[PDB]
Curated annotation (Swiss-Prot):
Cysteine disulfide partners in this protein: C2-C39, C3-C31, C15-C25
Keyword Ion transport: no
Protein name: Crambin
Subcellular location: Secreted
UniProt cross-references to InterPro entries, sorted A to Z: Thionin, Thionin-like_sf
Keyword annotations of the record: Disulfide bond, Plant defense, Secreted
Amino acid sequence: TCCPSIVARSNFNVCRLPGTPEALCATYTGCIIIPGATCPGDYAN
């Protein structure tokens, strides 16, 4: 997963702590799900 604003990630790692799919947090946090290709150059955080 790759998130822009650091804070957005902090929540993505916290929302995923429990039983939540990256999709449920990626939206509440603002991160994206990628099967590979590492992260972009403006959303790496």
